Structures are given as C-alpha cells and as structure tokens.
C-alpha cells in the first residue's frame, strides 16, 4: 500500500520549486552584528524561549539554573534554582505569568512569577525533550519514550496521549491557529497531530537520520526540519511530499535548531560547526553567516515582532543579533 | 525611577551567584556506568530516576551519579555528561558471554565525538568468582587467542594469565587511539576504592593543569 502512496505522490508532482524561482528578486547579502551579550551562567546553556512582548527571555543552564533576562538593559530579573541539575527544555507562557522546565528527572516543573513551584507533572517514563504552552491551562510535552502528551495544569493529570513514533521525540511546534501541532522524532519521520481528536492525521518521511528541530511557517501550512545528515527540508501539508531541500557539500555536521523570520523569507539554522547559517526559503541558497560562539550552538530564538534573533551555545554565553 | 529598582535587584543576583561559583568549582562530577550483571550497586553503597552519592575524601567532596530510568537507547542523553571529570566503567569479569557487549560499549564510549576528552577509570569486579571458576568454561571457547599468550596466584598462575589477558584486551583498544585509561582490580568486598578514585582524579587534574599553565 506504501507503493501506491509513493506513486500518488509522484503523480502529484509537476515541477520543482527551484525551477519556479527564475523570475524573482534575490534577497542579497545579509550581515548581522552582535548587539548585546548575556553572561551570567556557569555551565552550558541548553535551551531558551522568547517572550510574547519581545523583551523578556528565559534561559536554562546545565548546572541547575533558570535565569530570566531583560534583552534591553541586560538585567537579571530572576534566577531560580532547580531541584535537578540536568534539564533540556524551557518555555514561557503567552500571558507572561508562568514558566516551565524539564529534563532527566522525568518531571515537568511549572513556576509562577506573580517565585515558588506552582505545579509538578509526573507521568512520563523517559526524559522530556520539549514543552510548549497553548494557554495558561494546558501544556504539551514530548518524552523520550516515543510519546507526546497534552496535560491540564489544574487537575495535574494527563488528558490526551499521542503514541505514533518508533524513535524518541526530539522537538514539537504548535500552529498559530492553536489547533494542530507537529512533532519530529529519531526515526527520520515527522507527524502532524490534532489536539481535539488525538489521532495522527499525516506522516512525512523524507530524512535519513534523527530529526532534531521542527517549526511551523508563519502561514501555518508548511514546516522545515533539520536533522543529523547536514540537510534541511521543507514540507507542505497540502502537497504531502518533500517540497524543498537545503544542503551544502562542505558541511558534515548536524543541525541543532531551526527557526523562521517574520515574513517567512529567511530560515536560520544552527549547526555543530560552531556557527549559524541563514538560508533563503525560496531560492535555496546560503545567504548569511553568524559566527560568534566558541562552542556548538544549541538553541535559537526569533522574536514575535521580528526585530531580534538570540542564540545560545555551550560556551555559557547567550547573544543577541539584529 | 524604575531603573533604580532593577539595578538593585541585579546586584543581589550577581552576589549570590558568585557564592555558587565558590562551590560548583569545589566539587567534581563522576559518571558511574556499567551493566546489570556488574556490581555497580555494591560499589555505591560502600561510600554511602537518577541515584546520587556524595562522599568526601581528603576534604574533597565528590558527587557521583548512577543514572537509569530510560529505555535501552542511550545515544542522546550521553551528550549531557560532557563536563564530567571521569567515567567509572564497571565490568563483570566472570561472564565471558556478556564481555563482548562490554568491549563494544567501551569502544563506543571511547570513540565518541563528545566523549573524546573525558577519561575512563575501569573496574574489573567479581574476581573471587573468577578464581573459583578458573580453578574448578575454559575462557577460550569465546576468545580464540588465549591459547597463545604470555603474562607481561597462591597455587596456580593461570588466574594471573586470565586477568592480565582481560585487562590487555581492554587496554589495547584504549591505546589504539588527550585522555587515558586507569585499570584496577577490585573484589566483592573492598574499602579502598575511594582512595583509588581520589588518586586517579588527582593524576587527571594534574595532567590537565600541566597544559593550561603553558608548560606542555
């Protein structure tokens, strides 16, 4: 039955995206400089998330610290310690009230900033890899036991469970309509899920290794994934196939983080070669280099107004580019 | 106005964090690892999700983490232990059927990209069973190289031949390719493993500090 699916996806293909970009104005050279530099962490910074107001951000380090930074004045607002030293993810609530963290301890911790531990969620058997806020009442998590989950914070119990993957899930991203979300795992496959029903709508298989990053388009109808085979791939939910690919012959390192810009024109990817690359989303050609870190970049974020891009690496420094 | 209250809260944060830098630099992190048949749980009881053990020797505190709560796959979270001082690898030396899995795990640890600068202290546990098993299998049906081997012990020197053959099999792949390997012989009961870990960590930190002070 898979051969019929492959034949249908071949029959739905008319022409490539790169051949349709003949008559379009190119972006040109993009140069960005480090504006601010945040330096207060001890061990390696592992994840971050930008706020809704595009001013306050949160950073999680591997020594057991979670620090809220002001991007304008470089001021440390809060510095919350952790029960477990090993964490892998953090998220920031859209209303600005709550913050979340998780890691090797198999617990999702939710802190209130109105600073004490407001909620502890404990239902998983593998390490937490990503977490996001739909509202200040429901939370979506992905674990290392091939399961995603949607929880209610007030009851503190799991409401829905998504079990479709064979390898460990590494990243998830919600839609701007807050009704669908995609998840990428360690089986070279990305899946689209609906939060109301709880069933896998569609499955895409394009990569060759573990997928480390995934994020939606601003439109909400496409997404790009980065993996360990030094390639980035853009899929579309309507064409049901691998729409575009971005790769270079001089790179042999994986992709750690993937984000878009405000208009969807640019695509920023952090690599394990101590640098970040800035690709064009339609011409499929490399156009920018951001190199300022002495270790591998591990987390990337783009503001909700498209005014700043913040990177964080294993050199315990978080930097802001404009 | 409002900027003065932000600067006052900032200076309280950078003070206490500095005190944290006084203690995080004063302790050393070790990663204990092994197999289910290996007696790694008997080791951590003597100095005493994720199990933790704190022990102090020569007024130096060590915090060592016995980790397991996950599946069989370990190729993703093993990147978390990049800044550890040492990896304590425990091998059950009385089971030759499971020894090849231990050697392959040692190869995958030693040739990893993010673990290419972290040294390994190797323990070969359960040797009373090795003596009572060799004196009473034949340790050559699984390895067809024991029949031609010379040693580089109360009544028979065959146990010395077996022990040095196993540690030479472990050391050949270590010396085939920054970071060292420190093998020791340990028994079921032993109250000197903390001293061995202390001395090996002392040698590791001394060899690391010989380079940062520009003395080669």
């Amino acid at each position: 039955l898979k051969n019929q699916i492959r034949d249908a996806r071949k029959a739905c293909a008319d022409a490539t995206l790169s051949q349709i970009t003949n008559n379009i104005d190119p972006v040109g050279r993009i140069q960005m400089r480090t504006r601010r530099t945040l330096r207060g962490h001890l061990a390696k910074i592992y994840a971050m998330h930008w706020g809704t107001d595009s001013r306050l951000l949160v950073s999680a380090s591997q020594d057991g610290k979670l620090i809220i930074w002001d991007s304008y004045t470089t001021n440390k607002v809060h510095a919350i310690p952790l029960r477990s030293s090993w964490v892998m993810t953090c998220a920031y609530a859209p209303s600005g009230n709550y913050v979340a963290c998780g890691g090797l301890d198999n617990i999702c911790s939710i802190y209130n900033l109105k600073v004490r531990v407001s909620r502890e969620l404990a239902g998983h058997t593998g390490y937490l890899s990503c977490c996001r806020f739909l509202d200040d009442n429901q939370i979506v998590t992905s674990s290392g036991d091939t399961t995603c989950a949607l929880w209610d914070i007030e009851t503190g119990q799991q409401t829905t469970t998504f079990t479709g993957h064979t390898g460990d899930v590494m990243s998830l991203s919600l839609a701007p309509d807050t009704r669908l979300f995609v998840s990428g795992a360690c089986d070279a496959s990305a899946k689209l899920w609906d939060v109301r029903e709880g069933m896998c709508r569609q499955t895409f298989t394009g990569h060759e290794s573990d997928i480390n990053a995934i994020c939606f388009f601003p439109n909400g109808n496409a997404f790009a994934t980065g993996s360990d085979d030094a390639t980035c791939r853009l899929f579309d939910l309507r064409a049901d196939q691998e729409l575009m690919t971005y790769s270079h012959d001089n790179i042999i390192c994986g992709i750690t983080s993937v984000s878009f810009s405000k208009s969807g024109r640019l695509l920023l990817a952090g690599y394990d070669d101590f640098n970040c690359n800035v690709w064009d989303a339609l011409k499929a050609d490399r156009a920018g280099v951001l190199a300022g870190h002495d270790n591998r970049v591990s987390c990337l974020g783009v503001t909700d107004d498209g005014m700043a891009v913040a990177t964080g690496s294993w050199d315990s420094f978080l930097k802001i580019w404009n | 106005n409002e900027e003065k209250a932000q600067r006052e809260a900032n200076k309280k944060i950078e003070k206490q964090l500095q005190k944290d830098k006084q203690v995080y630099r004063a302790t050393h992190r070790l990663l204990l690892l092994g197999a289910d048949n290996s007696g790694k749980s008997t080791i951590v009881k003597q100095m005493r999700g994720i199990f933790e053990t704190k022990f102090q020797v020569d007024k130096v505190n060590f915090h060592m983490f016995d980790v397991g709560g996950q599946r069989d796959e370990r190729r993703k979270w093993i990147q978390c232990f990049n800044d550890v001082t040492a990896i304590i690898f425990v091998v059950d030396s009385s089971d030759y059927n499971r020894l090849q899995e231990a050697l392959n795990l040692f190869k995958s640890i030693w040739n990893n990209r993010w673990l290419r600068t972290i040294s390994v202290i190797l323990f070969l546990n359960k040797q009373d069973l090795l003596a009572e098993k060799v004196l009473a299998s034949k340790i050559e049906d699984y390895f067809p190289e024991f029949a031609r081997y010379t040693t580089p012990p109360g009544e028979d020197p065959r146990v010395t031949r077996a022990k040095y053959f196993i540690r030479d099999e472990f050391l050949r792949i270590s010396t085939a390719s920054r970071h060292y390997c420190y093998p020791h012989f340990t028994c079921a009961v032993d109250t000197e493993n903390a001293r061995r870990i202390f001395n090996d960590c002392r040698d590791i930190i001394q060899r690391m500090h010989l380079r940062q002070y520009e003395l080669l």
Partner: nanobody
Amino acid sequence: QVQLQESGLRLSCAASGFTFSNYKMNWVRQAPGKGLEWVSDISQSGASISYTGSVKGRFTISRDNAKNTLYLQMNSLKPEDTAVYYCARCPAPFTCFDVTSTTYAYRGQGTQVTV
C-alpha cells in the same frame, strides 16, 4: 524512507533510501530464547573489518557500494548458528551506539537460518 531487505549460504542485505557510502554496517544475530548478540561489522570503505571471537576464521563480510548491498559468507555450520539474522546501520555518519537494542529503527526484519 530507509529500507533494508534481507534474503538467504550467502546472505544478502539490500539497502535503499540513503547513501550507502557513508555508514558503517553491522550483522547482528538473534537466537531463539536469547537476546540480541553482535556478530560482525564493516566500516565505510571495507578497510576495517571485525568479528566476534566465536565466528572469526569461519565467517566473512563484504560490501558492494556500486550496487549498495552487503553480503555475508558463512561456512562450517554448527547447531548453535540457528538464528534470525539482521543487517543494521549505526545512525550517525562519519563516526553509533544502539545497534543492539530492543526497538531500533534502522534495521530490517531478518532471515531465519536453521542448521
């Protein structure tokens, strides 16, 4: 999608969906009633070839990157060799831990050999 198909006494493993000239390949057996055991492995160019000590001098492994296939030649059989055989790929190129795992996503269904 990555696809590994076994056939087979010369056992053949055919690969599709990925570039065969970048990954180190393994042959892993599974006895009835026993766990997974590592048998043999071959590097990207075939210069480095290693076996388990129980099969050394009795098995042989080869790879053909022109047609992207992996052959195993095995002779002088014993009753202990009755097992299910899988060809496995360790994940990261240019290097690779979990080829001996209960649920691994980069190996085929295997073939039964009964002596």
